[PDB]
């Protein structure tokens, strides 16, 4: 029916992804290796949408991951979610690698392990005889995500062509340059892949995060465990038109195809704000739907770094406003009311714009049958400012003689650096052209 | 096509096994109702139509006319 | 129904009438059958009255379920009358039941009569289905050619339609008559209604087997392929030559096109209501 | 009426038509030496189909057990079911055979003890005035099943040309080779006859039950006392609509003419899923029809070593689905409305396909009258891949010089190696030509 097949790939996709699904039983009212509640089937009315079908009421993720490292996946095995996965769907017990830290690692490494990538996760694809798409949940940071994602957004566009591709890409960190050097290399070679040879992606900045992990969150030194609590949230949030019982915009292709105005621009600014636990102490008064979509379009809760005073000169074309869960609907047209008083998104000159608002029961549980949870999927076209920061950090790389020597030794002969530039440069430049 | 009369029953069937692989949380739910359709005005769709007929005393509830009104 | 329960047997003359000439019974009526058949096969007479009078005496006593053993010694089923004609047009036997007191106010002659007529058609697709049963197992009997794998072709066309639509369509026209019936058993009270359940039981088997005592097109659907079993099996008792088996395919070409040809017509047939004929056209869409 | 001889031959063919007669009296409600229980005539309708009939109500089974080797009748008489076989059918004590371990020793032992292997045996054939026909269950590991079976495939066929031959046989084991050698000769002699001298086999590869030993067993050392628990099961499962009263296909030549396409395509694959006793506590919720005959045309139940890519261009062309016991049968129409949507079988584009149902009830017993049962009898074209690895494995040893002097020193003066090289070729090409 609706059956979508993520592709877990590199040292970060990893993690994001498995605690996603792990996110995915608590929220279904079911075990990794038991169904011990009856809340499955009376609370949550489809299940079987991102879930294979079961065949003993053991729901199996659809889901594959590969990485060079394997130590992303010796931290599985002793955790007690890991018996839902299956040992014969990806790999079996010792799987491995390269060495391994190169973009031309795993470029290379997607021909000679040719025949082994397209026979396993081909087996998920003719179980349904309709089949959604794939989304991509790999990894920008390093060169294990970055070198062999950039090879399946090819050999997947034409083999599979009828099928939707969008992925939830993570953006890595711009602080220092000292542990990796190699940034501005790998990233701008699978973002020109994500343009052309990808309809859609949902960007995640790094330097956005630790904006947040201190904003509300506490923390003194940052680590890697509280990357994956934003992440998960926001993926299952996502999808819950999608997964629990919605009217509009119930699929995945049904929510993209009402927010890229073109190709080549499709980088979806996300929000979303409730992220304390000692709000619930106060939430039991009726907070309303007429505060929690005013702090949305304003910049608070974005997860983009983009320029302050860069908002008078570009306008919003499509912004998404989801609420989950109660939503009091008597008042949600209500709080669309308000919006068109203050003018907070500036809307394009040429055409009209559209305040997209939808609501969808959310899980039988407590902390998610009494908090107000807000989903924001922007499209604002100030993210060529992100482009001119990781253009401005290629360039100037590139003058000062680094990774030109030690980077084409390998299955690479001709200059394909200004085959990336232009490119970026024709998405910044159709972008600020766009409003007329 | 135009319609012809023995469309209404394949159209059923297809419900049938449309709302079968779906996986209802209730089998008995999926046969309450078939589907009905006029005699050949142009094409079947705009001109299809639903019966879901009802027990014992809730049919007070609902009179035969205002089915219809659900239905067009 | 006190009485009519522990002082007559009045359900277990009904399902032994019913395994008699309905063939819910196991392999009873089935080695009624196969010397008949196989005399059919040979050219011998098994019309024939007085022999194929005791091949029906060996077929209720077999199986030994004592709903139908004991009415063998007993009230039989076992006398068949004849009708022989010259013109041989609406040659006809017709068995009957005996059915005894207070039973045959229920069970009237013209009751067991239509029950008569349902079993020489669900006899007569047992004689088409285990014509194409034994004959396989006959292989091929001769034994330019090669026309044996085109032949093949269309043979299992043919061959596997007769056997699902006696599997089928009739394991849905038994079992939901069968678990209907037992609801009216359920209920049971009373003399006026118990006639009354056995007489929409009947018209409900007939609606289940085909419909129709007047003229439809699902019999010239049945009739046809009746034609094609005849024509199929009188081929296969003789040998394969040069230019047979291309009259084999000759025939087989045609009778195709006219089982197509009755599928168009069966969809017209199905779209004007909901029937039994419904679940044919399932089966025939699946076939 | 419908009496078969079942002919038991061979090492391991003896043992798995013993627990096959002993597994019959648990399910009529019979003692081997009396008849304790009422059960068997009030629940059970038809007894003498399989047994002799009776003559004190002791049902005599119709069995013949020859074998070279003495070790396997040594523990039998020993075991309390043994007084239910006569020491007058087969043999009296003390039965003896070769040394013996060759395909040629049985092969020439049939015409020297041709007089009394043709006056026992047939004094059962005219006890009914109508034979069904003959099952060989005998065996194709070792000389001994394969060597003498391979003599009585040929003078049964003229001398009772009018009646059913089809086998049981077990396929032997192929995972090292160093304990027996002769495995690829023994093996595709007996299959030749298994092709052109009688009509029909049923495939039980070694190789795949250890598949299962391990799958839901739980056993840790493999040993030869499970190999007669998932064959004695289905053996009793394709009598039911013979032995129990059922309406169609009844009888042994009603099943075996709605499977087979053509001779020398009669390779039927079997599937059998409940073979679990800790399942029994939850099938008392109403476990329904609906579930029991999607996981048949999945690939888990399958007793046959086949290529798992090759199932795309290849076709099923009649396929067995048997219910059996409790069936609900006001649901068993639906179960079969599920199969068209899938299109799990690939259907054969020449011709029609036919998913057959049946059911029959099973014995008044409470592990049978709880449980659903589900007995498949496939028939795909996938079956070559057994046959081209017995090939590959037959002129890979025929070029490293094994057993070419060591075999043809008795009874063999030219080389009929090839002659079963051909006619199996001939088999592995008419099944990829029979789809056109």
């Known amino acids: 029916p609706r059956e979508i097949i993520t592709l877990q790939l590199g040292q970060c996709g990893n993690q994001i992804g498995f605690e996603f699904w792990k996110q995915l039983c608590a929220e279904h009212g079911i075990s990794p290796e038991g169904i011990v509640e009856e809340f499955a089937t009376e609370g949550t009315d489809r299940k079987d949408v991102f879930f294979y079908q079961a065949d003993d009421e053991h729901y199996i993720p659809r889901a594959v991951l590969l990485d060079l490292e394997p130590r992303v996946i010796h931290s599985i095995l002793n955790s007690p979610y890991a018996n839902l996965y299956n040992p014969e769907n990806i790999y079996l017990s010792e799987h491995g690698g390269g060495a391994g830290n190169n973009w031309a690692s795993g470029f290379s490494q997607g021909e000679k392990i040719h025949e082994d990538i397209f026979d396993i996760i081909d087996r998920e694809a003719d179980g349904s005889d309709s089949l959604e798409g794939f989304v991509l949940c790999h990894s920008i940071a390093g060169g294990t995500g970055s070198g062999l994602g950039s090879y399946l957004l090819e050999r997947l566009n034409d083999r599979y062509p009828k099928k939707l591709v969008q992925t939830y890409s993570v953006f890595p960190n711009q602080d220092e340059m000292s542990h990796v050097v190699v940034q501005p290399y790998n990233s701008l070679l699978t973002l020109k892949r994500l343009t052309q040879n990808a309809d859609c992606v949902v960007v995640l900045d790094n330097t956005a995060l630790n904006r947040i992990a201190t904003d509300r969150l506490h923390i003194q030194n940052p680590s890697f465990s509280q990357i994956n609590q934003l992440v998960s949230t926001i993926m299952s949030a996502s999808t819950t038109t999608l997964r629990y019982p919605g009217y509009m915009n119930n699929d995945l292709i049904g929510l993209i195809a009402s927010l890229i105005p073109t190709p080549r621009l499709h980088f979806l600014m996300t929000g979303y704000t409730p992220l304390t636990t000692d709000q619930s102490v106060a939430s039991v008064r009726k907070t309303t739907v007429l505060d929690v979509m005013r702090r949305l379009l304003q910049p608070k809760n974005v997860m983009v770094s983009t320029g302050r005073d860069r908002q008078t000169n570009h306008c919003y074309i499509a912004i998404l406003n989801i609420i989950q869960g109660e939503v009091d609907p008597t008042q949600v047209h209500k709080s669309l009311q308000r919006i068109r008083e203050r003018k907070l998104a500036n809307f394009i000159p040429w055409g009209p714009a559209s305040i997209q608002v939808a609501l969808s029961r959310k899980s039988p549980y407590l902390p998610s049958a009494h908090r107000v949870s807000g989903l924001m999927m922007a499209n604002h076209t100030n993210i060529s400012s992100l482009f001119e920061r990781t253009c401005r950090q290629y360039d100037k790389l590139r003058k000062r003689e680094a990774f030109l020597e030690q980077f084409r030794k390998e299955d690479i002969f001709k200059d394909n650096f200004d085959e990336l530039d232009n490119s970026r440069e024709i998405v910044q430049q159709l972008i600020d052209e766009y409003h007329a | ?72 | 129904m006190y009485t009519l329960k522990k002082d007559y047997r009045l359900v277990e003359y009904l399902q032994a009438m019913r395994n008699f000439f309905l063939l819910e019974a196991g392999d009873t009526m089935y080695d009624f059958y196969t010397p008949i058949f196989d005399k059919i096969r040979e050219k011998e007479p098994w019309l024939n009255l007085s022999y194929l009078n005791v091949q029906i005496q060996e077929a209720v006593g077999q199986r030994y379920p004592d709903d139908s053993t004991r009415l063998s010694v007993s009230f039989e089923s076992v006398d068949l009358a004849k009708k022989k004609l010259p013109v041989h047009t609406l040659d006809g036997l017709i068995l009957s039941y005996k059915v005894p007191w207070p039973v045959d106010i229920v069970i009237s002659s013209e009751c067991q009569k239509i029950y008569n007529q349902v079993f020489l058609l669900l006899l007569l697709i047992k004689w088409a289905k285990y014509s194409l049963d034994v004959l396989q197992f006959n292989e091929l009997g001769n034994a330019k050619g090669q026309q044996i794998h085109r032949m093949f072709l269309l043979r299992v066309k043919l061959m596997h339609f007769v056997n699902s639509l006696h599997n089928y369509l009739m394991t849905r026209i038994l079992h939901s008559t069968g678990l209907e019936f037992q609801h009216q058993v359920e209920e049971a009270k009373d003399l006026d209604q118990l006639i009354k359940i056995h007489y929409r039981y009947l018209s409900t088997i007939h609606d289940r087997c085909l419909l129709r005592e007047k003229v439809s097109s699902v019999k010239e659907a049945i009739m046809k392929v009746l034609n094609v079993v005849l024509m199929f099996a009188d081929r296969w008792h003789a040998g394969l030559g040069a230019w047979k088996k291309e009259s084999i395919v000759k025939m087989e070409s045609d009778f195709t096109n006219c089982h197509k040809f009755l599928v168009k017509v069966l969809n017209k047939a199905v779209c004007r209501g909901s029937f039994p004929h419904l679940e044919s056209l399932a089966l025939s869409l699946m076939a």
Do not use: C, M
Request: proline share 8%.
């Open chain 2, 1 to 72: 096509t135009p319609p012809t009369a023995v469309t209404e029953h394949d159209v059923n069937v297809a419900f049938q096994l449309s709302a079968h692989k779906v996986l209802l949380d209730d089998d008995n739910l999926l046969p309450l109702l078939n589907l009905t359709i006029r005699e050949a005005p142009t094409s079947g769709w705009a001109a299809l139509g639903l019966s879901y007929k009802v027990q014992w005393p809730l049919h007070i509830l609902f009179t035969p006319a205002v089915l219809e009104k659900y239905n067009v």
